[PDB]
Scaffold this motif. Sequence first.
Motif, PDB file in Angstrom:
ATOM      1  N   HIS A  41     -30.099  40.144 -76.558  1.00  0.00           N
ATOM      2  CA  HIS A  41     -30.149  39.722 -77.950  1.00  0.00           C
ATOM      3  C   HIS A  41     -28.755  39.429 -78.521  1.00  0.00           C
ATOM      4  O   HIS A  41     -28.634  39.148 -79.705  1.00  0.00           O
ATOM      5  CB  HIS A  41     -30.982  40.702 -78.787  1.00  0.00           C
ATOM      6  CG  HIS A  41     -30.253  41.964 -79.113  1.00  0.00           C
ATOM      7  ND1 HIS A  41     -30.651  43.188 -78.615  1.00  0.00           N
ATOM      8  CD2 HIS A  41     -29.186  42.192 -79.912  1.00  0.00           C
ATOM      9  CE1 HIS A  41     -29.836  44.120 -79.087  1.00  0.00           C
ATOM     10  NE2 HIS A  41     -28.932  43.538 -79.865  1.00  0.00           N
ATOM     11  N   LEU A 141     -25.005  53.084 -84.456  1.00  0.00           N
ATOM     12  CA  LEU A 141     -24.911  52.228 -85.632  1.00  0.00           C
ATOM     13  C   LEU A 141     -24.981  50.766 -85.196  1.00  0.00           C
ATOM     14  O   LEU A 141     -25.204  50.490 -84.017  1.00  0.00           O
ATOM     15  CB  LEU A 141     -23.585  52.548 -86.318  1.00  0.00           C
ATOM     16  CG  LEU A 141     -23.303  54.013 -86.665  1.00  0.00           C
ATOM     17  CD1 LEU A 141     -21.863  54.117 -87.128  1.00  0.00           C
ATOM     18  CD2 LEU A 141     -24.215  54.559 -87.732  1.00  0.00           C
ATOM     19  N   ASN A 142     -24.739  49.832 -86.126  1.00  0.00           N
ATOM     20  CA  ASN A 142     -24.701  48.426 -85.760  1.00  0.00           C
ATOM     21  C   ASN A 142     -23.564  48.195 -84.780  1.00  0.00           C
ATOM     22  O   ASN A 142     -22.526  48.825 -84.884  1.00  0.00           O
ATOM     23  CB  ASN A 142     -24.521  47.487 -86.949  1.00  0.00           C
ATOM     24  CG  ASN A 142     -25.707  47.508 -87.890  1.00  0.00           C
ATOM     25  OD1 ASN A 142     -26.867  47.518 -87.459  1.00  0.00           O
ATOM     26  ND2 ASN A 142     -25.453  47.533 -89.187  1.00  0.00           N
ATOM     27  N   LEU A 167     -35.767  52.785 -83.940  1.00  0.00           N
ATOM     28  CA  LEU A 167     -37.171  52.735 -84.293  1.00  0.00           C
ATOM     29  C   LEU A 167     -37.344  53.443 -85.624  1.00  0.00           C
ATOM     30  O   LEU A 167     -36.503  54.277 -85.955  1.00  0.00           O
ATOM     31  CB  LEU A 167     -38.023  53.392 -83.206  1.00  0.00           C
ATOM     32  CG  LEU A 167     -38.147  52.632 -81.881  1.00  0.00           C
ATOM     33  CD1 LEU A 167     -38.722  53.537 -80.805  1.00  0.00           C
ATOM     34  CD2 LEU A 167     -38.992  51.390 -82.006  1.00  0.00           C
ATOM     35  N   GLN A 189     -37.286  42.334 -83.873  1.00  0.00           N
ATOM     36  CA  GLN A 189     -37.309  43.032 -85.152  1.00  0.00           C
ATOM     37  C   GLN A 189     -38.681  42.857 -85.805  1.00  0.00           C
ATOM     38  O   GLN A 189     -38.900  41.915 -86.571  1.00  0.00           O
ATOM     39  CB  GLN A 189     -36.153  42.491 -85.998  1.00  0.00           C
ATOM     40  CG  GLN A 189     -35.921  43.248 -87.298  1.00  0.00           C
ATOM     41  CD  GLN A 189     -34.672  42.793 -88.023  1.00  0.00           C
ATOM     42  OE1 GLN A 189     -33.637  42.478 -87.421  1.00  0.00           O
ATOM     43  NE2 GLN A 189     -34.766  42.758 -89.339  1.00  0.00           N
TER      44      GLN A 189
HETATM   45  C1  LIG Z   1     -27.564  46.918 -81.346  1.00  0.00           C
HETATM   46  N1  LIG Z   1     -26.326  46.666 -81.493  1.00  0.00           N
HETATM   47  C2  LIG Z   1     -28.405  47.325 -82.540  1.00  0.00           C
HETATM   48  C3  LIG Z   1     -28.277  48.835 -82.738  1.00  0.00           C
HETATM   49  C4  LIG Z   1     -29.108  49.440 -83.866  1.00  0.00           C
HETATM   50  C5  LIG Z   1     -28.504  49.211 -85.238  1.00  0.00           C
HETATM   51  C6  LIG Z   1     -28.919  50.424 -86.068  1.00  0.00           C
HETATM   52  N2  LIG Z   1     -29.074  51.441 -85.045  1.00  0.00           N
HETATM   53  C7  LIG Z   1     -29.295  50.948 -83.823  1.00  0.00           C
HETATM   54  O1  LIG Z   1     -29.611  51.641 -82.823  1.00  0.00           O
HETATM   55  N3  LIG Z   1     -29.790  46.939 -82.333  1.00  0.00           N
HETATM   56  C8  LIG Z   1     -30.485  46.148 -83.168  1.00  0.00           C
HETATM   57  O2  LIG Z   1     -30.089  45.753 -84.260  1.00  0.00           O
HETATM   58  C9  LIG Z   1     -31.889  45.784 -82.719  1.00  0.00           C
HETATM   59  C10 LIG Z   1     -31.953  44.343 -82.291  1.00  0.00           C
HETATM   60  C11 LIG Z   1     -32.686  43.575 -83.367  1.00  0.00           C
HETATM   61  C12 LIG Z   1     -33.195  44.554 -84.391  1.00  0.00           C
HETATM   62  N4  LIG Z   1     -32.780  45.857 -83.865  1.00  0.00           N
HETATM   63  C13 LIG Z   1     -33.104  47.065 -84.335  1.00  0.00           C
HETATM   64  O3  LIG Z   1     -32.676  48.059 -83.813  1.00  0.00           O
HETATM   65  C14 LIG Z   1     -34.020  47.148 -85.548  1.00  0.00           C
HETATM   66  N5  LIG Z   1     -35.199  47.889 -85.155  1.00  0.00           N
HETATM   67  C15 LIG Z   1     -36.408  47.343 -85.241  1.00  0.00           C
HETATM   68  O4  LIG Z   1     -36.622  46.208 -85.604  1.00  0.00           O
HETATM   69  C16 LIG Z   1     -37.595  48.232 -84.887  1.00  0.00           C
HETATM   70  F1  LIG Z   1     -38.175  48.726 -85.981  1.00  0.00           F
HETATM   71  F2  LIG Z   1     -38.480  47.565 -84.167  1.00  0.00           F
HETATM   72  F3  LIG Z   1     -37.245  49.258 -84.147  1.00  0.00           F
HETATM   73  C17 LIG Z   1     -33.365  47.722 -86.813  1.00  0.00           C
HETATM   74  C18 LIG Z   1     -34.241  47.447 -88.036  1.00  0.00           C
HETATM   75  C19 LIG Z   1     -32.024  47.006 -87.026  1.00  0.00           C
HETATM   76  C20 LIG Z   1     -33.151  49.239 -86.705  1.00  0.00           C
HETATM   77  C21 LIG Z   1     -33.248  43.632 -81.974  1.00  0.00           C
HETATM   78  C22 LIG Z   1     -33.069  42.396 -81.117  1.00  0.00           C
HETATM   79  C23 LIG Z   1     -34.558  44.341 -81.697  1.00  0.00           C
END
Ligand SMILES: *C(=N)[C@H](C[C@@H]1CCNC1=O)NC(=O)[C@@H]1[C@@H]2[C@H](CN1C(=O)[C@@H](NC(=O)C(F)(F)F)C(C)(C)C)C2(C)C
Lengths: 306, 306
Positions: A41, A141-142, A167, A189
């Motif tokens: 991704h 985090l991000n 999650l 997402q």
């Molecule tokens: C990778 N760098 C990030 C790490 C995330 C950010 C917050 N904590 C973490 O572990 N991963 C992501 O941003 C992934 C990525 C898109 C969205 N995402 C999510 O982790 C999201 N989760 C979901 O959509 C859900 F609910 F299905 F788990 C988010 C809302 C940002 C927590 C992709 C491609 C899945």
Amino acid sequence: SGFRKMAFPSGKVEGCMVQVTCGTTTLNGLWLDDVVYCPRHVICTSEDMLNPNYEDLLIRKSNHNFLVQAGNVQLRVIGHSMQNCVLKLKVDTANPKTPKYKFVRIQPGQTFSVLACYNGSPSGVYQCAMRPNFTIKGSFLNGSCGSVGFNIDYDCVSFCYMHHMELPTGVHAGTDLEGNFYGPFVDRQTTQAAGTDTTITVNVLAWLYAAVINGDRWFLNRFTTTLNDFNLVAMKYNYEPLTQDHVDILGPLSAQTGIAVLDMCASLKELLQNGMNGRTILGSALLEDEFTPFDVVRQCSGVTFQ
Amino acid sequence: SGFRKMAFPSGKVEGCMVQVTCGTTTLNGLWLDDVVYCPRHVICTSEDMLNPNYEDLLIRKSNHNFLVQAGNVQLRVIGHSMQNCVLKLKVDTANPKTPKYKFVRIQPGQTFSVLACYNGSPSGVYQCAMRPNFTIKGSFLNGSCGSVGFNIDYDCVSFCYMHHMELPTGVHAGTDLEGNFYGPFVDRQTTQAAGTDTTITVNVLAWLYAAVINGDRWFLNRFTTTLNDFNLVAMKYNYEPLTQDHVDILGPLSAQTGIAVLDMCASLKELLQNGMNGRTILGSALLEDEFTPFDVVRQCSGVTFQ
Ligand SMILES: *C(=N)[C@H](C[C@@H]1CCNC1=O)NC(=O)[C@@H]1[C@@H]2[C@H](CN1C(=O)[C@@H](NC(=O)C(F)(F)F)C(C)(C)C)C2(C)C
Ligand SMILES: *C(=N)[C@H](C[C@@H]1CCNC1=O)NC(=O)[C@@H]1[C@@H]2[C@H](CN1C(=O)[C@@H](NC(=O)C(F)(F)F)C(C)(C)C)C2(C)C
């Protein structure tokens, strides 16, 4: 002589981390020989991530579209492919700090160390467990994605996790290093739920052995039990079935403390029925399920690496 | 996004560990430039350790009496001196993996990472706190001495602990890297007691801030309080006095969550009076005091090293 949530030393893996940028998305990579592995991704924009078509995005990418930085040094990409939810970038330089390593896919119940990274730089290291619902209770985090989970055996690094997503419930999800998710999650997402989590019975017993070794023995009773009967009382408390393979795996701890495994099971039955009545075990008022038999043995007999 | 007992990555320090043998005693050393630092009780036999005369033992030692091994490579010693309870061995080779480093002496309440080692090889890494009674709740076996405690700031390793001994209650004691003990302990095998341990109030509040950031907010009340009044109620529960310097140190967490420090103090008062009534905070039924303000900020904003 003390008992802590201990992680593997991280140096061997720190030498493998790099930064992967594609467009404006930046996350972490693992550089091993002449290949960098990272989450696929990285090729998305924000808006793609709601429902992405990965193969379609990758067509529009060249080698030069991926920016790979090892420290200050930039690594020229000379090839790219996608394997499940992971991406492999062939580079012109083999990583001179590549350790002996293998890719493994752990089982629910197994533990490992996570090296949380941001921008290809290590932030910290902690020990996790693969929960039975195929999630982990990590801290990310991000920009953390591509951070990896691992075990060390003497000189060989066994990479078992790569972080992808978080999650709804604060817990985390990811893949093995061949890019297959653990559990039923996908890299998009959208709403995803975990499944109910069960407690890892064999790890609890291992922890109780850890407690005896360390002089905490108040919960030992004089009774025994049978595997069958034990497992009936555990079911009610959302504890996993204890197999005979578990019993055998607990043989070394049984042998060293001179406490038959089914005696410890008896002691655990009592704790599940009566609660602790306000006492602690190894400093904790909750039964702990994130240490394997192997973890207890390495910590309480002093196994080292390299 | 999760909250864990996180340690610093260890690679920079793993590159400094070596094995020091003298007679039959073997323990760990820290190699920095052309000097190896290790605990001075490496020059003892067993029977010496009950009441040792260190200066007397060191007279009878030559350079060649100390066996220093970095991996397989042996380091010729070319000088020796003793500084408090630590020993410095000048060697003929400067360590090419020496990081930027300083020696610091932390204060009670501060945290650090321990790299537990045996035979100069790293076994594992965990995060500790210097308790107010000048002990640490670590995990160490025979041969662990010379394992070190540290903090990392970007590129600089701040070494603050070296392990020496274990105290009757399962807790541990040691020195700074200039060889001065923390607390009233000495390096001899005789009865030593710890002193009563008090709870580090500022670290608890930091942990409560950590909890809000992570969505756990049930313990917040609508009330405030004064520093004075707060400190009267804390005294009864063996909580340290909260100084104004603590309040100021908590300003960044206060600012980010928009919760005045004295509101959080109010919330803590209630928890000390009423207990939790069977709830958890960040997974724990006990209030946790082993995270500093700085630790919470680095983990919940994603600070990295190098
Ligand atoms: C990778 N760098 C990030 C790490 C995330 C950010 C917050 N904590 C973490 O572990 N991963 C992501 O941003 C992934 C990525 C898109 C969205 N995402 C999510 O982790 C999201 N989760 C979901 O959509 C859900 F609910 F299905 F788990 C988010 C809302 C940002 C927590 C992709 C491609 C899945
Ligand atoms: C260093 N390699 C060891 C590490 C110890 C071994 C068990 N867990 C540890 O942390 N340090 C020692 O053996 C030191 C050393 C002699 C005795 N000692 C102790 O730690 C002993 N403690 C005490 O005598 C007491 F009670 F004062 F704390 C021991 C009984 C072995 C736990 C010297 C020079 C103090």
